[PDB]
């Protein structure tokens, strides 16, 4: 197989920057110990393409996750902070835009390259966080 589009995001991530993201577990209904430890954490993110699977690994030392998937096929994913949830990914025009259903709510995660970065943006319910990511 050649090259996709999506090799664009492939690699080693190290957050960088966090904005409002305290704000954003409130929304999801993130507990007060998990926000704390949470939000504290530093994590890589890791992605890999091998064929039609995307893979993106968070490692920190509040937890390590994985999701594998397939664009517009829809996945179950237990996120870090123990929620079970249906999760979709799509590509919108360069964007990963990954949709989470869980107890009758709903989040939007966007990943997009900007620069040298990977700016992931998470948005519940008017409640937005940008965290951006560089190479490690
Ligand atoms: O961390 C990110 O940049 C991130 C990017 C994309 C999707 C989810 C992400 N993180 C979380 C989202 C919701 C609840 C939680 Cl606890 C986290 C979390 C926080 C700290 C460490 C690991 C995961």
């Given at each position: 197989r050649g090259s996709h589009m999506?090799?664009?995001?492939?690699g080693t991530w190290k957050l960088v920057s966090s904005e409002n993201f305290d704000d954003y577990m409130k929304e999801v209904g993130v507990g007060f110990a998990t926000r704390k430890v949470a939000g504290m954490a530093k994590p890589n993110m890791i992605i890999s393409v091998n064929g039609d699977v995307i893979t993106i690994k968070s490692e920190s030392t509040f937890k390590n996750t994985e999701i594998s998937f397939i664009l517009g096929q829809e996945f179950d994913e237990v996120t870090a902070d123990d929620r079970k949830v249906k999760s979709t990914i799509t590509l919108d025009g360069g964007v990963l835009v990954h949709v989470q259903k869980w107890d009758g709510k709903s989040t939007t995660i966007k990943r997009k390259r900007e620069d040298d970065k990977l700016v992931v943006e998470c948005v519940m319910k008017g409640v937005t966080s940008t965290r951006v990511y560089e190479r490690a």
């Open positions: 999506c090799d664009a995001f492939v």
